[PDB]
Amino acid sequence: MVNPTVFFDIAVDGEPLGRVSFELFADKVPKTAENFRALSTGEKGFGYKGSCFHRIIPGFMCQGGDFTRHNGTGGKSIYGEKFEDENFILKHTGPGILSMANAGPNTNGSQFFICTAKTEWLDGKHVVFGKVKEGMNIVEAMERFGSRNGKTSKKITIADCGQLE
Ligand SMILES: NC(=O)c1ccccn1
Ligand SMILES: NC(=O)c1ccccn1
Ligand SMILES: NC(=O)c1ccccn1
C-alpha cells in the first residue's frame, strides 16, 4: 500500500501555530512507522495528543513524544516499554528527518525528534522512519522557541494529531 501520513497540529502557549504533516516510511521500517502512526491516532488508548516538544535546540532538532514524564525520561511504544532498532537503512540527511530518540541500543519507546539540520553522527544509532511532508515553515517557527541548552521559552504542544487520507 501507500506510506501513511500523519499530522500534528502545533500550539504555542495554547495558541494555534500550524500543522506539520509527516510521511512515515512503512515500506522500509514498517514496525517503527506503525508505532508512531498508532501513537498519532491514539487508537491504542495512549499517544501524542496534548504532549509537548520538551527539548528544542535551534540548528539541531525538536524532540518530543514523552507523554508519561513530559521531560525526556519517559514514553512507551505500542509494543511495550521498549522495542528493538528495526534497521538503519535510512540516514539523517538534513532538516525534516523524523527519527527515534533512545538511550542505548534497542531502547525505542515513543520519543522521536525532528531534525532541523543534517545529523550524520546519528546514522546507524537512531532509526530514521519518516520525514516532514508539509509545514517545515511550522517546524522552523517551533525551533525559534528553543535555546542552546534545549529549554523552550514557550510551551510547544501537539494540540491535535491524527492520520490523513
Ligand atoms: N539521546 C537521544 O535520543 C538523541 C535524540 C536526538 C539527537 C541526539 N540524541
Ligand atoms: N526514547 C526513549 O524512550 C528515551 C530516550 C532518552 C531517555 C529515556 N527514554
Ligand atoms: N560526527 C560528524 O560527522 C559531525 C559533523 C559535524 C558536527 C559534528 N559531528
Short mmCIF file of N, CA and C and ligand atoms in Angstrom, two decimals:
data_model
loop_
_atom_site.label_atom_id
_atom_site.label_comp_id
_atom_site.label_asym_id
_atom_site.label_seq_id
_atom_site.Cartn_x
_atom_site.Cartn_y
_atom_site.Cartn_z
N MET A 1 0.83 -1.24 0.00
CA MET A 1 0.00 0.00 0.00
C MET A 1 0.86 1.27 0.00
N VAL A 2 0.19 2.41 0.25
CA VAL A 2 0.78 3.74 0.25
C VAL A 2 1.30 3.93 1.68
N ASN A 3 2.48 4.55 1.81
CA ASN A 3 3.03 5.04 3.11
C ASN A 3 2.01 5.95 3.81
N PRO A 4 1.77 5.74 5.11
CA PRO A 4 0.83 6.59 5.84
C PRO A 4 1.39 8.02 6.07
N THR A 5 0.45 8.93 6.27
CA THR A 5 0.71 10.31 6.55
C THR A 5 -0.01 10.62 7.81
N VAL A 6 0.72 11.30 8.69
CA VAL A 6 0.24 11.70 9.99
C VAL A 6 0.40 13.24 10.16
N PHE A 7 -0.50 13.88 10.88
CA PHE A 7 -0.37 15.33 11.12
C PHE A 7 -0.24 15.63 12.62
N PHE A 8 0.48 16.71 12.92
CA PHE A 8 0.45 17.31 14.23
C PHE A 8 -0.06 18.73 14.06
N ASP A 9 -1.06 19.09 14.84
CA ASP A 9 -1.46 20.47 14.98
C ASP A 9 -0.75 21.08 16.21
N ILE A 10 0.15 22.02 15.91
CA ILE A 10 1.03 22.63 16.92
C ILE A 10 0.44 23.92 17.54
N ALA A 11 0.58 24.05 18.88
CA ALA A 11 0.20 25.24 19.64
C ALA A 11 1.41 25.73 20.42
N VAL A 12 1.42 27.05 20.65
CA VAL A 12 2.49 27.76 21.36
C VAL A 12 1.84 28.54 22.50
N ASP A 13 2.16 28.13 23.73
CA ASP A 13 1.38 28.60 24.90
C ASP A 13 -0.15 28.52 24.67
N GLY A 14 -0.64 27.38 24.17
CA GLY A 14 -2.07 27.19 23.90
C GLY A 14 -2.62 27.84 22.62
N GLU A 15 -1.85 28.75 22.00
CA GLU A 15 -2.26 29.41 20.76
C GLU A 15 -1.91 28.61 19.48
N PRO A 16 -2.93 28.33 18.62
CA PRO A 16 -2.63 27.62 17.35
C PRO A 16 -1.48 28.24 16.55
N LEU A 17 -0.56 27.40 16.08
CA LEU A 17 0.54 27.84 15.24
C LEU A 17 0.32 27.34 13.78
N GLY A 18 0.23 26.04 13.60
CA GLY A 18 0.00 25.45 12.29
C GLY A 18 0.15 23.93 12.36
N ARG A 19 0.15 23.31 11.18
CA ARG A 19 0.15 21.87 11.05
C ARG A 19 1.44 21.42 10.39
N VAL A 20 2.06 20.40 10.97
CA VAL A 20 3.17 19.68 10.39
C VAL A 20 2.63 18.31 9.97
N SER A 21 2.85 17.92 8.72
CA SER A 21 2.48 16.58 8.31
C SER A 21 3.75 15.77 8.02
N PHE A 22 3.64 14.45 8.22
CA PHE A 22 4.73 13.52 8.05
C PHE A 22 4.43 12.33 7.17
N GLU A 23 5.37 12.02 6.28
CA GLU A 23 5.34 10.76 5.56
C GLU A 23 6.09 9.78 6.48
N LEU A 24 5.45 8.65 6.79
CA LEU A 24 6.08 7.56 7.58
C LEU A 24 6.51 6.41 6.64
N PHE A 25 7.76 6.00 6.77
CA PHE A 25 8.40 5.11 5.80
C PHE A 25 8.12 3.62 6.10
N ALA A 26 6.84 3.25 6.05
CA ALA A 26 6.37 1.91 6.40
C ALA A 26 6.92 0.85 5.43
N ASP A 27 7.18 1.30 4.20
CA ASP A 27 7.86 0.46 3.22
C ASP A 27 9.29 0.03 3.63
N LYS A 28 10.00 0.82 4.48
CA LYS A 28 11.35 0.41 4.92
C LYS A 28 11.49 0.07 6.39
N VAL A 29 10.64 0.68 7.23
CA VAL A 29 10.70 0.45 8.68
C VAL A 29 9.25 0.29 9.11
N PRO A 30 8.59 -0.79 8.66
CA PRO A 30 7.15 -0.90 8.96
C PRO A 30 6.81 -0.92 10.49
N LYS A 31 7.64 -1.61 11.28
CA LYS A 31 7.40 -1.71 12.73
C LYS A 31 7.42 -0.34 13.44
N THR A 32 8.47 0.41 13.16
CA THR A 32 8.75 1.73 13.72
C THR A 32 7.70 2.75 13.23
N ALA A 33 7.35 2.65 11.93
CA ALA A 33 6.34 3.54 11.34
C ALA A 33 4.97 3.34 11.99
N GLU A 34 4.60 2.06 12.19
CA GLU A 34 3.31 1.67 12.82
C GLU A 34 3.17 2.20 14.24
N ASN A 35 4.27 2.14 15.00
CA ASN A 35 4.32 2.70 16.35
C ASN A 35 3.96 4.21 16.39
N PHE A 36 4.69 4.98 15.59
CA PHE A 36 4.47 6.43 15.50
C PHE A 36 3.04 6.71 14.93
N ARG A 37 2.64 5.98 13.89
CA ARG A 37 1.29 6.10 13.37
C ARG A 37 0.19 5.92 14.44
N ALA A 38 0.25 4.80 15.17
CA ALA A 38 -0.77 4.50 16.23
C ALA A 38 -0.72 5.46 17.44
N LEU A 39 0.51 5.89 17.83
CA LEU A 39 0.65 6.94 18.84
C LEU A 39 0.03 8.27 18.36
N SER A 40 0.12 8.57 17.08
CA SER A 40 -0.51 9.76 16.49
C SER A 40 -2.05 9.75 16.44
N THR A 41 -2.66 8.58 16.22
CA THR A 41 -4.12 8.46 16.16
C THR A 41 -4.71 8.30 17.54
N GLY A 42 -3.89 7.77 18.46
CA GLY A 42 -4.27 7.50 19.87
C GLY A 42 -5.13 6.21 19.99
N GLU A 43 -5.13 5.39 18.94
CA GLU A 43 -6.08 4.25 18.83
C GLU A 43 -5.81 3.08 19.76
N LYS A 44 -4.66 3.04 20.42
CA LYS A 44 -4.42 2.05 21.47
C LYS A 44 -4.79 2.57 22.83
N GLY A 45 -5.27 3.81 22.91
CA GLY A 45 -5.66 4.40 24.19
C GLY A 45 -4.65 5.34 24.80
N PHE A 46 -3.50 5.55 24.11
CA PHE A 46 -2.45 6.47 24.60
C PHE A 46 -1.68 6.98 23.36
N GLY A 47 -0.85 8.01 23.55
CA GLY A 47 -0.11 8.62 22.45
C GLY A 47 0.19 10.10 22.64
N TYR A 48 0.45 10.74 21.50
CA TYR A 48 1.00 12.07 21.42
C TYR A 48 0.07 13.26 21.67
N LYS A 49 -1.24 13.11 21.55
CA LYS A 49 -2.13 14.28 21.66
C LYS A 49 -2.06 14.96 23.06
N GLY A 50 -1.79 16.27 23.03
CA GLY A 50 -1.64 17.11 24.24
C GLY A 50 -0.20 17.11 24.76
N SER A 51 0.71 16.28 24.23
CA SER A 51 2.07 16.24 24.79
C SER A 51 2.89 17.41 24.21
N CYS A 52 4.12 17.61 24.67
CA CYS A 52 4.93 18.72 24.19
C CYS A 52 6.30 18.35 23.58
N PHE A 53 6.85 19.34 22.88
CA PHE A 53 8.23 19.30 22.45
C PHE A 53 9.08 19.87 23.61
N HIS A 54 9.61 18.96 24.41
CA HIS A 54 10.28 19.34 25.67
C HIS A 54 11.73 19.87 25.48
N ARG A 55 12.36 19.58 24.33
CA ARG A 55 13.77 19.93 24.13
C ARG A 55 13.87 20.37 22.66
N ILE A 56 14.22 21.65 22.43
CA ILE A 56 14.39 22.24 21.10
C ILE A 56 15.69 23.00 21.05
N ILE A 57 16.59 22.54 20.17
CA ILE A 57 17.85 23.21 20.00
C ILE A 57 17.94 23.76 18.58
N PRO A 58 17.84 25.09 18.41
CA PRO A 58 17.97 25.62 17.05
C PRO A 58 19.30 25.18 16.34
N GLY A 59 19.17 24.97 15.03
CA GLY A 59 20.22 24.38 14.25
C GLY A 59 20.55 22.92 14.60
N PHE A 60 19.64 22.22 15.30
CA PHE A 60 19.89 20.82 15.62
C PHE A 60 18.61 19.93 15.48
N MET A 61 17.67 20.09 16.39
CA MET A 61 16.48 19.25 16.35
C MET A 61 15.39 19.71 17.36
N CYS A 62 14.17 19.24 17.12
CA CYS A 62 12.99 19.39 18.01
C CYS A 62 12.65 17.95 18.47
N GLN A 63 12.65 17.75 19.80
CA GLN A 63 12.39 16.47 20.40
C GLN A 63 11.07 16.48 21.20
N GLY A 64 10.28 15.42 21.00
CA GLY A 64 9.03 15.23 21.73
C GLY A 64 8.66 13.78 21.97
N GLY A 65 7.38 13.57 22.24
CA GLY A 65 6.84 12.24 22.35
C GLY A 65 6.86 11.63 23.77
N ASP A 66 7.31 12.37 24.78
CA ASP A 66 7.30 11.84 26.17
C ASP A 66 5.95 12.19 26.88
N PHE A 67 4.93 11.35 26.74
CA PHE A 67 3.58 11.67 27.27
C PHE A 67 3.37 11.03 28.64
N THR A 68 4.41 10.40 29.18
CA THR A 68 4.37 9.81 30.56
C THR A 68 5.21 10.56 31.61
N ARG A 69 6.37 11.17 31.22
CA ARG A 69 7.13 12.06 32.19
C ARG A 69 7.36 13.52 31.75
N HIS A 70 6.96 13.80 30.49
CA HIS A 70 6.85 15.17 29.95
C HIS A 70 8.19 15.91 29.99
N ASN A 71 9.32 15.19 29.98
CA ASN A 71 10.63 15.84 30.13
C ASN A 71 11.77 15.14 29.44
N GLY A 72 11.49 14.06 28.73
CA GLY A 72 12.57 13.31 28.06
C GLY A 72 13.02 11.98 28.70
N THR A 73 12.42 11.66 29.86
CA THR A 73 12.76 10.43 30.56
C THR A 73 11.67 9.35 30.43
N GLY A 74 10.60 9.59 29.66
CA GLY A 74 9.54 8.61 29.61
C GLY A 74 9.04 8.24 28.26
N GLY A 75 7.75 7.87 28.22
CA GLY A 75 7.13 7.40 26.98
C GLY A 75 7.17 5.88 26.87
N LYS A 76 6.38 5.34 25.95
CA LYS A 76 6.32 3.88 25.76
C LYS A 76 5.80 3.63 24.38
N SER A 77 6.18 2.49 23.82
CA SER A 77 5.75 2.18 22.47
C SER A 77 4.37 1.47 22.55
N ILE A 78 3.80 1.13 21.40
CA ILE A 78 2.60 0.29 21.29
C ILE A 78 2.94 -1.21 21.51
N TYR A 79 4.22 -1.54 21.59
CA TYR A 79 4.67 -2.92 21.75
C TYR A 79 5.08 -3.25 23.16
N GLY A 80 5.00 -2.30 24.09
CA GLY A 80 5.65 -2.50 25.40
C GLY A 80 6.55 -1.30 25.67
N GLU A 81 7.16 -1.25 26.85
CA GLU A 81 8.05 -0.14 27.25
C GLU A 81 9.06 0.23 26.14
N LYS A 82 9.76 -0.79 25.62
CA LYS A 82 10.84 -0.56 24.66
C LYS A 82 10.77 -1.54 23.47
N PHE A 83 11.22 -1.11 22.28
CA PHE A 83 11.39 -2.09 21.17
C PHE A 83 12.73 -1.86 20.46
N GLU A 84 13.18 -2.91 19.78
CA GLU A 84 14.49 -3.02 19.13
C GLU A 84 14.67 -2.02 17.99
N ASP A 85 15.93 -1.74 17.64
CA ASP A 85 16.24 -0.94 16.46
C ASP A 85 15.91 -1.83 15.32
N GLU A 86 14.95 -1.41 14.48
CA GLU A 86 14.41 -2.28 13.42
C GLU A 86 15.45 -2.42 12.32
N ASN A 87 15.98 -1.31 11.84
CA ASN A 87 17.10 -1.32 10.89
C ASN A 87 17.65 0.12 10.84
N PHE A 88 18.74 0.34 10.10
CA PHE A 88 19.32 1.67 9.95
C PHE A 88 19.49 1.97 8.45
N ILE A 89 18.50 1.60 7.67
CA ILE A 89 18.56 1.73 6.23
C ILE A 89 18.59 3.23 5.91
N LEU A 90 17.78 4.03 6.60
CA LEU A 90 17.68 5.45 6.31
C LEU A 90 18.61 6.33 7.16
N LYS A 91 19.13 7.37 6.53
CA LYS A 91 20.22 8.17 7.14
C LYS A 91 19.60 9.53 7.55
N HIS A 92 20.32 10.28 8.38
CA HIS A 92 19.85 11.58 8.84
C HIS A 92 20.44 12.61 7.87
N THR A 93 19.72 12.83 6.78
CA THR A 93 20.27 13.58 5.64
C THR A 93 20.18 15.12 5.73
N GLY A 94 19.30 15.62 6.61
CA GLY A 94 19.01 17.06 6.66
C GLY A 94 17.74 17.41 7.44
N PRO A 95 17.31 18.72 7.41
CA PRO A 95 16.08 19.21 8.08
C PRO A 95 14.84 18.43 7.65
N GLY A 96 13.89 18.26 8.57
CA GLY A 96 12.73 17.43 8.29
C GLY A 96 12.77 15.91 8.54
N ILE A 97 13.97 15.32 8.65
CA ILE A 97 14.15 13.92 9.04
C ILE A 97 13.46 13.63 10.39
N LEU A 98 12.65 12.61 10.36
CA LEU A 98 11.96 12.14 11.56
C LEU A 98 12.57 10.82 12.07
N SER A 99 13.02 10.83 13.34
CA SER A 99 13.90 9.78 13.84
C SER A 99 13.58 9.47 15.32
N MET A 100 13.93 8.27 15.75
CA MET A 100 13.59 7.78 17.08
C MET A 100 14.66 8.18 18.10
N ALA A 101 14.24 8.76 19.22
CA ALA A 101 15.12 9.10 20.33
C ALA A 101 15.39 7.78 21.06
N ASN A 102 16.51 7.65 21.77
CA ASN A 102 16.76 6.40 22.53
C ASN A 102 17.83 6.65 23.58
N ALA A 103 18.12 5.66 24.42
CA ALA A 103 19.11 5.83 25.49
C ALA A 103 20.05 4.65 25.43
N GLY A 104 20.32 4.13 24.24
CA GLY A 104 21.15 2.91 24.11
C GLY A 104 20.59 2.05 23.03
N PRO A 105 21.34 0.98 22.60
CA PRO A 105 20.83 0.04 21.55
C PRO A 105 19.47 -0.50 21.99
N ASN A 106 18.50 -0.59 21.07
CA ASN A 106 17.27 -1.36 21.31
C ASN A 106 16.43 -0.81 22.47
N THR A 107 16.29 0.51 22.51
CA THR A 107 15.50 1.14 23.57
C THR A 107 14.48 2.18 23.00
N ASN A 108 13.92 1.92 21.84
CA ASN A 108 12.91 2.83 21.28
C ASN A 108 11.61 2.72 22.11
N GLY A 109 10.90 3.82 22.29
CA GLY A 109 9.63 3.85 23.05
C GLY A 109 8.69 4.68 22.16
N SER A 110 8.43 5.91 22.62
CA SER A 110 7.60 6.90 21.89
C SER A 110 8.33 8.19 21.52
N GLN A 111 9.42 8.50 22.23
CA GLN A 111 10.09 9.75 21.95
C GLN A 111 10.78 9.74 20.57
N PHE A 112 10.75 10.89 19.93
CA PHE A 112 11.16 10.97 18.50
C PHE A 112 11.77 12.37 18.45
N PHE A 113 12.47 12.68 17.37
CA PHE A 113 12.90 14.05 17.11
C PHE A 113 12.78 14.41 15.61
N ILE A 114 12.59 15.71 15.35
CA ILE A 114 12.50 16.21 14.00
C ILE A 114 13.85 16.95 13.83
N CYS A 115 14.69 16.46 12.93
CA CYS A 115 15.91 17.17 12.58
C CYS A 115 15.64 18.51 11.89
N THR A 116 16.40 19.52 12.31
CA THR A 116 16.41 20.81 11.66
C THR A 116 17.76 21.09 11.01
N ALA A 117 18.64 20.08 11.01
CA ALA A 117 19.98 20.11 10.35
C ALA A 117 20.33 18.67 9.95
N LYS A 118 21.37 18.49 9.14
CA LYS A 118 21.95 17.17 8.90
C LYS A 118 22.68 16.69 10.18
N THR A 119 22.42 15.49 10.62
CA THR A 119 23.00 14.98 11.91
C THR A 119 23.55 13.57 11.57
N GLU A 120 24.53 13.51 10.66
CA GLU A 120 25.11 12.23 10.23
C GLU A 120 25.74 11.37 11.36
N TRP A 121 26.20 11.99 12.45
CA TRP A 121 26.79 11.21 13.59
C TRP A 121 25.76 10.29 14.27
N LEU A 122 24.48 10.57 13.97
CA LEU A 122 23.36 9.74 14.46
C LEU A 122 23.06 8.53 13.54
N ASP A 123 23.60 8.50 12.33
CA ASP A 123 23.34 7.34 11.44
C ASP A 123 23.81 5.99 12.06
N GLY A 124 22.96 4.96 11.99
CA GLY A 124 23.37 3.63 12.50
C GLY A 124 23.19 3.55 14.02
N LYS A 125 22.79 4.66 14.64
CA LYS A 125 22.37 4.58 16.07
C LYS A 125 20.94 5.04 16.41
N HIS A 126 20.32 5.83 15.53
CA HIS A 126 18.96 6.24 15.70
C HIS A 126 18.21 5.82 14.44
N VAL A 127 17.07 5.17 14.63
CA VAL A 127 16.28 4.65 13.50
C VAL A 127 15.44 5.78 12.85
N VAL A 128 15.75 6.07 11.58
CA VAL A 128 15.01 7.11 10.84
C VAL A 128 13.77 6.47 10.21
N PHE A 129 12.57 7.06 10.37
CA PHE A 129 11.36 6.35 9.91
C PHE A 129 10.33 7.22 9.20
N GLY A 130 10.69 8.48 8.98
CA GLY A 130 9.77 9.42 8.37
C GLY A 130 10.46 10.70 8.01
N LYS A 131 9.64 11.60 7.47
CA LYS A 131 10.11 12.90 7.05
C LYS A 131 8.93 13.86 7.02
N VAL A 132 9.20 15.12 7.35
CA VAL A 132 8.20 16.18 7.24
C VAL A 132 7.83 16.31 5.73
N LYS A 133 6.52 16.28 5.49
CA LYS A 133 5.91 16.42 4.17
C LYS A 133 5.42 17.89 3.94
N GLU A 134 4.61 18.40 4.84
CA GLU A 134 4.20 19.79 4.80
C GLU A 134 4.45 20.40 6.16
N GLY A 135 4.58 21.72 6.15
CA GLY A 135 4.68 22.53 7.37
C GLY A 135 6.09 22.57 7.93
N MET A 136 7.10 22.49 7.07
CA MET A 136 8.50 22.71 7.54
C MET A 136 8.67 24.18 8.02
N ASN A 137 7.88 25.12 7.46
CA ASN A 137 7.77 26.50 7.98
C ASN A 137 7.27 26.53 9.43
N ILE A 138 6.40 25.59 9.77
CA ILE A 138 5.89 25.50 11.15
C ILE A 138 6.95 24.91 12.08
N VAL A 139 7.62 23.84 11.63
CA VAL A 139 8.83 23.29 12.37
C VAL A 139 9.90 24.42 12.60
N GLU A 140 10.19 25.22 11.58
CA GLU A 140 11.08 26.41 11.77
C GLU A 140 10.59 27.51 12.76
N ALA A 141 9.29 27.75 12.77
CA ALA A 141 8.65 28.56 13.80
C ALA A 141 8.79 27.99 15.23
N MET A 142 8.50 26.70 15.37
CA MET A 142 8.73 25.97 16.63
C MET A 142 10.13 26.18 17.16
N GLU A 143 11.10 26.02 16.27
CA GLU A 143 12.53 25.93 16.59
C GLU A 143 13.04 27.23 17.24
N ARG A 144 12.49 28.36 16.75
CA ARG A 144 12.72 29.70 17.32
C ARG A 144 12.33 29.81 18.78
N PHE A 145 11.48 28.90 19.28
CA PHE A 145 11.21 28.84 20.74
C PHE A 145 12.19 27.96 21.52
N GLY A 146 13.14 27.35 20.83
CA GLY A 146 14.15 26.64 21.55
C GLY A 146 15.27 27.58 22.08
N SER A 147 16.31 26.95 22.63
CA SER A 147 17.52 27.62 23.09
C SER A 147 18.73 26.68 22.97
N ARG A 148 19.90 27.24 23.25
CA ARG A 148 21.14 26.44 23.17
C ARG A 148 21.12 25.20 24.09
N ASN A 149 20.62 25.34 25.32
CA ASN A 149 20.56 24.16 26.23
C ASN A 149 19.27 23.33 26.01
N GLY A 150 18.40 23.77 25.08
CA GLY A 150 17.21 22.98 24.71
C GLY A 150 15.88 23.36 25.40
N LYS A 151 15.96 24.13 26.49
CA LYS A 151 14.79 24.63 27.23
C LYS A 151 14.02 25.59 26.29
N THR A 152 12.70 25.42 26.25
CA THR A 152 11.82 26.21 25.33
C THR A 152 11.31 27.42 26.16
N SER A 153 11.21 28.57 25.49
CA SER A 153 10.89 29.86 26.10
C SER A 153 9.34 29.98 26.12
N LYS A 154 8.69 29.16 25.29
CA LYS A 154 7.25 28.95 25.33
C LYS A 154 6.92 27.46 25.25
N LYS A 155 5.76 27.11 25.76
CA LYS A 155 5.30 25.74 25.79
C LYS A 155 4.79 25.30 24.39
N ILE A 156 5.46 24.31 23.76
CA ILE A 156 5.16 23.89 22.37
C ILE A 156 4.40 22.58 22.44
N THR A 157 3.12 22.55 22.06
CA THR A 157 2.34 21.35 22.22
C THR A 157 1.72 20.82 20.93
N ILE A 158 1.48 19.51 20.95
CA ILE A 158 0.71 18.81 19.90
C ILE A 158 -0.77 18.90 20.40
N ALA A 159 -1.43 19.99 20.00
CA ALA A 159 -2.82 20.31 20.39
C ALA A 159 -3.74 19.23 19.80
N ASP A 160 -3.42 18.78 18.61
CA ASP A 160 -4.17 17.68 17.97
C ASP A 160 -3.22 16.90 17.05
N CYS A 161 -3.54 15.64 16.80
CA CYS A 161 -2.77 14.82 15.87
C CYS A 161 -3.64 13.65 15.34
N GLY A 162 -3.26 13.09 14.19
CA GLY A 162 -4.13 12.15 13.52
C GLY A 162 -3.48 11.61 12.28
N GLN A 163 -4.23 10.74 11.60
CA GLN A 163 -3.78 10.20 10.32
C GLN A 163 -4.58 10.92 9.22
N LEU A 164 -3.90 11.21 8.12
CA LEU A 164 -4.55 11.84 6.99
C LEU A 164 -4.79 10.80 5.92
N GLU A 165 -5.86 11.01 5.15
CA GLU A 165 -6.18 10.20 3.96
C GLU A 165 -5.11 10.27 2.87
N1 LIG B 1 19.83 10.77 23.07
C1 LIG B 1 18.84 10.91 22.10
O1 LIG B 1 17.80 10.26 21.99
C2 LIG B 1 19.12 11.89 20.99
C3 LIG B 1 17.99 12.44 20.37
C4 LIG B 1 18.24 13.35 19.34
C5 LIG B 1 19.55 13.63 18.98
C6 LIG B 1 20.64 13.06 19.64
N2 LIG B 1 20.40 12.20 20.59
N1 LIG B 2 13.28 7.31 23.59
C1 LIG B 2 13.07 6.99 24.85
O1 LIG B 2 12.18 6.19 25.16
C2 LIG B 2 14.09 7.63 25.89
C3 LIG B 2 15.13 8.47 25.42
C4 LIG B 2 16.02 9.03 26.33
C5 LIG B 2 15.87 8.73 27.69
C6 LIG B 2 14.83 7.90 28.12
N2 LIG B 2 13.97 7.38 27.24
N1 LIG B 3 30.38 13.31 13.55
C1 LIG B 3 30.23 14.06 12.49
O1 LIG B 3 30.22 13.60 11.35
C2 LIG B 3 29.95 15.56 12.82
C3 LIG B 3 29.81 16.52 11.80
C4 LIG B 3 29.54 17.85 12.15
C5 LIG B 3 29.41 18.17 13.50
C6 LIG B 3 29.53 17.18 14.48
N2 LIG B 3 29.81 15.92 14.12
#
